[PDB]
């Protein structure tokens, strides 16, 4: 791994074609623990100092209990270092899948954590995410707080081959997205995540890509499986997140004031 002025790099947590994320203990503090994303400068489309630091200022100001904090930004001769809040529970995708499903009560707590993050971000006109359980992390396994993460560093630290890099998971992408579309795609995504939490797999889970495409392009309303049976409110919310016509899909205003979501926790 890389040696850094302020931290000791322990386990590998993540790997990309270009980046690597290590866990880290602060040197002279040790109880202080971070996740550090490392990216070689050679992999990046070079950028203004103005523009990059401007973007880092903006990311560091995106501070919410259910968003992974960018704590600091460092660099050396070879790399950049995005120093993040460490989430010790791992990703929401393992969490669901190793438990098969989450019961409605737990799903609910999680959705209100994720919605409170999304409302905050919506207020700031931040949107068009790649929301999925793999980019959502857990503060711990003990009574976990979910944390939205950005697994794809972008904008002024984008790579040279940005126009040849494929973006989105299609199991979480709003169909209008995969085929002109506003931030209401994020509400679709929330729907997929809720559905995956209650039923164990995204609505469009599939053996193959043609199978997947079929489902994305279909006009069938999404059928909720029979079990578990869920409260009338949960089912209302979920049906209205998973509406294909974005015009017909729930508003952000309605999502945030929706009874099942509370937002009077
Ligand atoms: N390169 C690349 C692609 N990955 C990321 O961008 C990425 C990965 C991890 C984190 C991150 C941030 C904060 N905390 C953590 N915690 C974390 C803890 C455990 C695990 N896993 C434990 C189980 O095995 C898989 C790793 C993953 C993340 N990760 C942020 C971005």
From Swiss-Prot:
Its main location: cytoplasm. One of its GO terms (molecular function) is ATP binding. Induction: Up-regulated during senescence. Serine/threonine protein kinase that acts as a regulator of Sonic hedgehog (SHH) signaling and autophagy. Acts as a negative regulator of SHH signaling in the absence of SHH ligand: interacts with SUFU, thereby inactivating the protein kinase activity and preventing phosphorylation of GLI proteins (GLI1, GLI2 and/or GLI3). Positively regulates SHH signaling in the presence of SHH: dissociates from SUFU, autophosphorylates and mediates phosphorylation of GLI2, activating it and promoting its nuclear translocation. Autophosphorylated. Autophosphorylation is blocked by interaction with SUFU. Keywords: ATP-binding, Autophagy, Cytoplasm, Kinase, Nucleotide-binding, Phosphoprotein, Repeat, Serine/threonine-protein kinase, Transferase. GO terms for cellular component: autophagosome; ciliary tip; cytoplasm; cytosol; phagophore assembly site; phagophore assembly site membrane. It is found in: Cytoplasm. Changing residue 132 to R: Loss of kinase activity. Does not promote GLI1 nuclear localization. Residues 7-261 form the Protein kinase domain. Signal peptide: none annotated. It catalyses: L-seryl-[protein] + ATP = O-phospho-L-seryl-[protein] + ADP + H(+); L-threonyl-[protein] + ATP = O-phospho-L-threonyl-[protein] + ADP + H(+). The keyword Metal-binding does not apply. It is an enzyme of class 2 (transferase). This is Serine/threonine-protein kinase ULK3. The modification Phosphoserine is found at residue 169. One of its GO terms (biological process) is smoothened signaling pathway. Its EC number is 2.7.11.1. It comes from Homo sapiens. Interacts (via protein kinase domain) with SUFU. ATP binds at residues 13-21, 37.
